[PDB]
Motif scaffolding. Structure first.
Motif, PDB file in Angstrom:
ATOM      1  N   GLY A   1       0.189  -1.111   0.154  1.00 42.95           N
ATOM      2  CA  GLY A   1      -0.049  -0.164  -0.181  1.00 42.95           C
ATOM      3  C   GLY A   1       0.638   0.836   0.099  1.00 42.95           C
TER       4      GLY A   1
ATOM      5  N   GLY B   1      -2.035   3.922  -4.720  1.00 44.81           N
ATOM      6  CA  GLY B   1      -3.343   3.834  -5.168  1.00 44.81           C
ATOM      7  C   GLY B   1      -3.283   3.579  -6.413  1.00 44.81           C
TER       8      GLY B   1
ATOM      9  N   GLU C   1      -7.815   0.480  -6.947  1.00 44.15           N
ATOM     10  CA  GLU C   1      -8.575   0.285  -6.540  1.00 44.15           C
ATOM     11  C   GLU C   1      -9.670   2.020  -6.525  1.00 44.15           C
TER      12      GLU C   1
ATOM     13  N   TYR D   1      -1.737  -7.576   0.346  1.00 42.42           N
ATOM     14  CA  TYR D   1      -1.767  -6.311   0.318  1.00 42.42           C
ATOM     15  C   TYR D   1      -1.122  -6.281   1.982  1.00 42.42           C
TER      16      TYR D   1
ATOM     17  N   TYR E   1      -0.358  -3.626   3.771  1.00 38.48           N
ATOM     18  CA  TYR E   1      -0.634  -1.652   4.324  1.00 38.48           C
ATOM     19  C   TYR E   1      -0.879  -2.212   5.637  1.00 38.48           C
TER      20      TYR E   1
ATOM     21  N   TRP F   1      -7.293   3.230   2.978  1.00 40.93           N
ATOM     22  CA  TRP F   1      -7.097   3.056   1.779  1.00 40.93           C
ATOM     23  C   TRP F   1      -6.673   1.965   2.190  1.00 40.93           C
TER      24      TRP F   1
ATOM     25  N   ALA G   1      -9.206  -0.726  -0.856  1.00 40.96           N
ATOM     26  CA  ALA G   1      -8.766  -1.719  -1.324  1.00 40.96           C
ATOM     27  C   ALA G   1      -9.058  -3.180  -1.297  1.00 40.96           C
TER      28      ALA G   1
ATOM     29  N   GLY H   1     -10.629  -3.635  -4.832  1.00 40.30           N
ATOM     30  CA  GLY H   1      -9.936  -4.071  -5.275  1.00 40.30           C
ATOM     31  C   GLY H   1      -9.515  -6.000  -4.863  1.00 40.30           C
TER      32      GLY H   1
ATOM     33  N   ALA I   1      -8.898  -7.373  -2.073  1.00 43.92           N
ATOM     34  CA  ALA I   1      -7.789  -7.322  -1.258  1.00 43.92           C
ATOM     35  C   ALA I   1      -8.123  -7.937   0.061  1.00 43.92           C
TER      36      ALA I   1
ATOM     37  N   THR J   1      -5.475  -7.059   3.406  1.00 41.40           N
ATOM     38  CA  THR J   1      -4.717  -6.612   3.990  1.00 41.40           C
ATOM     39  C   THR J   1      -4.121  -6.199   5.609  1.00 41.40           C
TER      40      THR J   1
END
Length: 1258
Positions: A560, A563, A566, A579, A581, A588, A592, A596, A598, A600
């Motif tokens: 992360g 951007g 996403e 991810y 992150y 954010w 995601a 996305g 994601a 995370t």
């Protein structure tokens, strides 16, 4: 006759219709069993059912030969609600049946034809569903050619659902249900058959196991797994591959209601898709809201999970008040990927926002990013299967792509404050994977060597930096494996285009290291464009095409740091999208997760240090040091001139009132105060707690490295843990209040400026003493804080420190639970779970979820390595946040008055971010409520879903008008709160109050007349981007230097941020620039909340991107630029600084702080990237606010360019990030934001040319 009971009766009528609705049914059949069963069902409904009565007429098909029977048939068909036919295989009569019914196909609420000759089958109609909408020919030709035929056609219907819309699919499901009842043939089967068709297609305006397992193709629900699996293996309609215990098995969670209702179409199709892909399915249901029961009972069998991954289709939490701790316990025992798809997906913007939040607290992954079911069903199915494949596939075979953004780092892109050593982290990840049994070949000797493999000559020592080419994709390969490529053409011509191209092929940049691949995605002015369909370039697709279809990754890991997809208005593919992150970035991370797909895993930001004093600032502190001695001496006057002269040299005259009045001419009172003012401003700098470097994933901080973080954790009152701040307890011990000490310190009363610094030092000492004892117990004891020191006549080493600091009689009963908490926090800060977190995701297991946020304000953010979530957007603001919002508003207004005649401002322009409102449980959001004098009202359950004005009595001052600029991220997470905000503004405008006590009404009335509308529509003040848009794009413009005058920046703000939210019609967010410009025209002040010291004004571009300060100066008639403030609540001592104050504080603690820049440059290449970021964001602030003092740019040139040692270090360390530093300084001078010597400009223009040559050639 002798062996089969036949009936003489063809017709059943109710004996007494009574009040009841009459359903008319005609049947044509061959089986006397189906005739008698139907009659008996009709007979039973008539004698019991008290709102429905049925008439039944039919003929055994043979009897339709007679013209006597056929004329009655036509008449009965004409009047009939339901037509039913079965086993009709005679040329002559079939046609007669078609001729009879064909006219009334519109009439008939439904016509159900069971296996008959194809002519009769085409009569089938049940709402939208007919034989036209099928695997039509598949059965049509088999129908032309028993118990088999009924089952063949039944097994087909689930396969059809996906190609239909949800309404037309449920009609197909109703057909399938009605077919299952028929094959049943029981009197209660055919009762339910009739009552079902009557309830959904005739009289919808009439009446109507706690948990278990369900399958569409089983009539009965299974109460245990053995019975279910027993049944599953006896299924002849499925491959042997599904019955094999090594088969991928996927668990679905759904509500009983939808099974009871029969409104289960999308569930059937979900079951069908998974089974079509060779997944065994276990669908669990519950009438209750505790779904941990079916999960714990039906996904197990010493006991083992019999499920490879789980897809929730409930739209709810697992448990429930909702219970996330027990949900997590249950999902961690099971230890499988937990996926979620809201019902809303199948079946408006406020609803998806309120709902999607809740499964995220359960650690849900979202295989649906936020026309027929197909795309949604295929999406959940494929993504669920690839999570199971990760579970099954052996370690040595598993392929892991690791993607990197913006290397080399040139154009800012849209960088977060990641504080990540990217290659530092990849290298550690790669070692971890090898040493764990993944197949990594050719692991480099160090991170530098790894960076070298991926970016050839990154440092431009011997050649220009050149990204490694892992593959050259031919157009033939691209277009074949990228079916959506043709869609991109609009904006990038035919492949391969001008990006990641050698002219012939598309270039995939990266390097293979066995089963691990490091790929970079570094990003058309040579082509003229005309549309608004912003699509990614061929190269960007090519990269994802390679990973998914050519190199065939089993999972992909992102950072992360930027951007990507996403934030753009299924390039990702089906494989797990992982991810790393930052914990400190839940907003954010949420985007995601939602945009996305994601998963995370959280990482910690470098353990923060106090920024400290250097050079001139340190000299100034030394002078101030002597002041008390030189007073007792009697010479306490000439020092104050030296102190002022040095302050003036440090540019602190811009932060403290330093009049040109010699100390001789003051009294002792207003000399103390001069010093006191300067001192507390240096202690603001000295003590600013922030990261001075980068994090490497899986490298946690030493207990010592954690002390500064532990100090600031110790320095907040926590009502929710029953513990006080150490400073609070220290003050109480000397009969003082920290709120008073903080306020008298802000005024600069030296005694209290000194007392604050004294209490700080005592706090730093006592926490340092806890860490030392924890260290030199070295595991021997569980918790040194729980040790019973009183029992051996000892004082705890921190009670000792307090006494040595000069503070005995600190309440030790209140210190006990505090220092217990601090040790627990120290454990979590120092924990090492980040790499573990990744291993678990790649083993197809459940990564523990937890809250993203501020580790100092909410230590539950620790430990890292969890799948981070935001929070329930109805759980804010809390009472503590509302109460804390009043203090900041009172302080903002107090200061605006003090610097403007004593007169309240009429309008405040404010930004709202998701990030800070997650971290503070709604502080900055509640500041805007309190400005117009509204309060949020939580219902019994404690959901904040309502809002009310407070009386002016309570407010103590007029209602301030507001222009509320909500980020696209704020809108995506907290549109519920935008709804409350709009309600409050409009209540204010409508309030029967005097205009001089109500600036909202005052403006709205004037605007209602001007615009020819009502007071309410005129009080439109809540704005954001258009749906699925983000930022004013002023960030992009500053980062790419693609603008001439400030008006370009102002224009794109007014274009993009003028979308008005309306509580009276929320689904509409119509652009309203006319209202936007009118409100902004009235703005006396701009205002933002500082997220965190690590995400401050210079650390990111997002703050300046949303800054309307200069824009307002353009819009106003007087041309007057508004006062600009930034709230800082990050410590217990909330400051409302000016924008210029905050930018200076940033420059002094970061860019020009040797601790900071030496800290960053100690990581080498990626260090220089951090330096240019702040310089670039500092430029943005010149462009949107002109809030940057000239000395910031001078000192930057002095420190990094004029010092030839540093200048060579930076250009060698990182030419790309250095060229960027040199570019920025030239730009801010070239645009009028920096005045400097012709020498300084020549040194830069030369250096620019030097590094230009290194990066490009000559």
């Amino acid at each position: 006759m002798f062996t089969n009971v036949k009936s003489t009766i063809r017709r059943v009528d109710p004996e007494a219709l009574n009040g009841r609705q009459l359903l008319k049914v005609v049947y044509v059949v061959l089986e006397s069993q189906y005739q008698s069963a139907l009659s008996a069902a009709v007979r039973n409904i008539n004698r019991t059912n008290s709102s429905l009565a049925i008439q039944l007429t039919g003929y055994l098909i043979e009897e339709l030969r007679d013209p006597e029977n056929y004329a009655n048939f036509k008449h009965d068909v004409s009047e009939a609600n339901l037509f039913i036919a079965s086993l009709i295989f005679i040329e002559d009569l079939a046609d007669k049946v078609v001729e009879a019914v064909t006219p009334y196909r519109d009439n008939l609420d439904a016509a159900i034809v069971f296996p008959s000759m194809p002519q009769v089958m085409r009569l089938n109609k049940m709402g939208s569903f007919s034989m036209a909408q099928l695997s039509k020919s598949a059965i049509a030709q088999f129908m032309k050619k028993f118990q088999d035929a009924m089952l063949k056609l039944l097994r087909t219907l689930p396969t059809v659902l996906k190609y239909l819309p949800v309404e037309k699919a449920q009609d197909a499901r109703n057909f399938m249900l009605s077919f299952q009842y028929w094959l049943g043939g029981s009197q209660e089967n055919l009762e339910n058959f009739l009552l079902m068709l009557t309830d959904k297609y005739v009289y919808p305006d009439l009446g109507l196991p706690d948990m278990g397992i369900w399958h569409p193709l089983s009539m009965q629900m299974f109460e245990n797994v053995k019975d279910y699996l027993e049944w599953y293996n006896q299924r002849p309609d499925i491959s042997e591959d599904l019955k094999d215990p090594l088969a991928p098995c996927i668990g679905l969670i759904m509500q009983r209601t939808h099974l009871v209702t029969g409104d289960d179409a999308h569930y059937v199709g979900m079951v069908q898709e998974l089974e079509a892909m060779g997944a065994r399915v276990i669908c669990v249901f519950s009438g209750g809201l505790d779904f941990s029961k079916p999960v714990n009972e039906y996904f197990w069998d010493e006991p083992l999970p019999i499920v490879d991954a789980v897809v929730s289709l409930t739209g709810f939490a697992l448990v429930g008040r909702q219970d996330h701790p027990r949900a997590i316990e249950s999902l961690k025992k099971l230890n499988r990927p937990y996926m979620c798809a809201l019902p809303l997906v199948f079946q408006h913007p406020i609803q998806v926002a309120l709902q999607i939040a809740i499964p995220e607290l359960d650690g849900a992954i979202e295989p649906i990013i936020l026309i027929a079911l197909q795309d949604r069903l295929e999406a959940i199915a494929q993504r669920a299967m690839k999570w199971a494949n990760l579970r099954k596939k052996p370690k040595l075979d598993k392929k892991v792509a690791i993607t990197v953004f913006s290397f080399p780092p040139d154009k800012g892109n849209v960088g977060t404050a990641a504080y990540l050593d990217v290659f530092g982290s990849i290298y550690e990840v790669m070692k971890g994977l090898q040493g764990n049994g993944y197949d990594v070949q050719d692991l480099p000797g160090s991170a530098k060597e790894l960076m070298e493999a991926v970016i050839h000559d990154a440092q431009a020592q011997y050649n220009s930096p050149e990204l490694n080419i892992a593959h050259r994709m031919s157009v033939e390969q691209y277009e074949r494996l990228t079916p959506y490529s043709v869609r991109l053409e609009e904006n990038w011509g035919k492949p391969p285009g001008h990006l990641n191209s050698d002219g012939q092929n598309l270039l995939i940049y990266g390097k293979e290291f066995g089963n691990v691949f490091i790929g970079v995605q570094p990003t058309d002015p040579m082509r003229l464009l005309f549309s608004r369909s912003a699509s990614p370039h061929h190269g960007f697709a090519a990269y994802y095409t390679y990973l998914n279809h050519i190199w065939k990754a089993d999972a992909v890991l992102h950072f992360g740091t930027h951007g990507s997809l996403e934030f753009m208005p299924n390039l990702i593919g089906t494989i797990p999208n992982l991810y790393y992150y930052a914990a400190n970035n839940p907003s954010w991370a949420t985007i995601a997760k939602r945009r996305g797909y994601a998963s995370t895993i959280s990482y910690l930001t470098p353990p923060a240090e106090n920024a400290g004093l250097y050079k001139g600032l340190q000299e100034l502190n030394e002078l101030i040091g002597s002041y008390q001695t030189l007073k007792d001496s009697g010479r306490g006057i000439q020092i104050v001139n030296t102190i002022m002269d040095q302050a003036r040299i440090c540019n602190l005259d811009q932060d403290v009132n330093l009049p040109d009045i010699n100390a001789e001419e003051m009294d002792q009172g207003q000399r103390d105060t001069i010093v006191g003012s300067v001192y507390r401003k240096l202690m603001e700098i000295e003590s600013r707690l922030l990261p001075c470097g980068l994090h490497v994933i899986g490298q946690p901080p030493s207990a010592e490295e954690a002390i500064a973080t532990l100090v600031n954790i110790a320095s907040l009152d926590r009502e929710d843990e029953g513990i006080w701040a150490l400073p609070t307890l220290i003050a109480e011990s000397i009969g003082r209040n920290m709120e008073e000490i903080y306020r008298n310190s802000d005024k600069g009363i030296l005694a209290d400026v000194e007392l604050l610094q004294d209490i700080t030092l005592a706090t730093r000492a006592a926490v340092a003493a806890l860490v030392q004892e924890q260290i030199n117990a070295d595991g021997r004891v569980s918790f040194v804080s729980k040790l019973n020191f009183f029992k051996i006549g000892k004082k705890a080493p921190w009670v000792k420190s307090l006494c040595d600091s000069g503070y005995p009689n600190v309440n030790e009963e209140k210190l006990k639970p505090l220092f217990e908490y601090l040790e627990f926090c120290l454990e979590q800060v120092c924990a090492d779970n980040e790499f573990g977190g990744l291993l678990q995701a790649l083993e197809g297991e459940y990564v523990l979820p937890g809250p993203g946020g501020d580790p100092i304000r909410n230590p539950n953010v620790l430990p890292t390595g969890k799948n981070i979530h935001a929070l329930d957007p109805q759980s804010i603001p809390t009472l503590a946040a509302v109460q804390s919002a009043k203090v900041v508003v009172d302080r903002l207004l107090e200061r605006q008055r003090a610097e403007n005649g004593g007169n309240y401002p009429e309008t405040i322009a404010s930004v709202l971010w998701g990030t800070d409102n997650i971290k503070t449980y709604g502080e900055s959001l509640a500041q805007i409520m309190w400005m117009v004098g509204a309060k949020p009202v939580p219902d019994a359950l404690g959901r904040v879903n309502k809002i009310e004005l407070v009386p002016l009595e309570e407010l103590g001052r007029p209602r301030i008008d507001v222009v509320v600029n909500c980020s696209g991220v704020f809108r995506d997470l907290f549109i519920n709160q935008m709804n409350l905000l709009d309600q409050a503004v409009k209540l204010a405008a409508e309030a029967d109050e005097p205009l001089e006590m109500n600036f909202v009404r005052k403006h709205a009335l004037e605007q209602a007349e001007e615009m020819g509308i009502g007071v309410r529509e005129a009080a439109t003040r809540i704005f954001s981007n258009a749906s699925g848009s983000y930022s004013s794009n002023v960030n992009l413009a500053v980062e790419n230097s693609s603008w001439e005058d400030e008006s370009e920046l102002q224009e794109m703000y007014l274009k993009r941020k003028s979308f008005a939210f309306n509580s009276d019609n929320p689904g509409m967010m119509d652009q309203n620039r006319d209202m936007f410009e009118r409100a902004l025209k009235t703005a006396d002040a701009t205002f933002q909340n500082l997220d965190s010291s690590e995400i401050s004004l210079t650390d990111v571009s997002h703050y300046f991107d949303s800054d309307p300060t200069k824009l307002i100066s353009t819009l106003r008639d007087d041309g007057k630029a508004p006062a600009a403030y930034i709230a800082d609540t990050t410590t217990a001592n909330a400051q409302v600084r000016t924008l210029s104050e905050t930018v200076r504080l940033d420059a002094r603690t970061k860019l020009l702080n040797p601790k900071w820049y030496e800290g960053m440059l100690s990581h080498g290449y990626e260090g220089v990237r951090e330096l240019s970021k702040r310089l670039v964001n500092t430029m943005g602030w010149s462009a949107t606010a002109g809030a940057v003092d000239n000395w910031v740019y001078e000192d930057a040139n002095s420190t990094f360019i004029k010092d030839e040692e540093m200048c060579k270090r930076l250009m060698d360390l990182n030419p790309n990030s250095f060229r960027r530093m040199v570019s920025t300084l030239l730009e801010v001078n070239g645009r009028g934001y920096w005045e400097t010597s012709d020498e300084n400009l020549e040194r830069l223009q030369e250096l620019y040319q030097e590094v230009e040559d290194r990066i490009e050639g000559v």
